[PDB]
Symmetry: C2
Subunit: 142 residues, 2 copies
Amino acid sequence: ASFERKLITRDALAAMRASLPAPVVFTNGVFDILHRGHVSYLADAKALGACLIVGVNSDASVRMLGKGDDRPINVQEDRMALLAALECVDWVVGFDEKTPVSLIEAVHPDILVKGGDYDMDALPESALVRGWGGRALAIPFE
Amino acid sequence: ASFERKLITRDALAAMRASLPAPVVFTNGVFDILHRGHVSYLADAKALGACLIVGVNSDASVRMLGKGDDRPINVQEDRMALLAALECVDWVVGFDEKTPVSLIEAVHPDILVKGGDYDMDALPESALVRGWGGRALAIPFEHDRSTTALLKKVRAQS
């Protein structure tokens, strides 16, 4: 239950933001079932910065998505708890919206990362983060 | 990549054993698909000691087992990598024998722990560990419902 110290609310993370070590790294995902690509990439993202925050889609927000699985088999608290058990993760935050844009606006990462092959230029959040001079990049699973 | 520092062979861990923080806690399992019960259990096992070592059954070892189905969804190195990524885990070793008895012989853990209500007196490794002044005990482990498990396996396959 000690890794649970990482589960935090958007408001609490927002208050704490100014005291986080730079550079702050952010990523988001469903993380329904953890596999080796997830953790390999979660570890590399941590290596890019001093602090790693993971945003986790709420059950619903997960339901507003056509590409990935429709109903995650694990409830948002369980998906978040697994992430928190990870050595490389510092903070795990849930968000309800369909996209992580307002969460990212609130968190204000210096570095935004995505796992997989994803055009970062096609992402709203890339523009958001680069908009204030941050970096956005994709890190491959394998 | 940093977390892979924890994946080690029996011989190297055995040679390193004397300098590990005591008490050394050992547990073993297949750990096919991690769930919250697993990580809750591993944290509790870690809290019993100063150092946690996880024995991971080899794919061949699983074949050899009558537990659940006859095979695993993830190969041994992926199952070991997942565990090594956990904050509470210090060392992950894979064994190929039917049971972890020999590995436990080589590792010499001070505390053997098992999740669930399991008669520890019926395990050879319990007597072995108690034989050199160590401890063996069961601590509650939360299993996921069979349905969720079957849904999980399917998902993995997909």
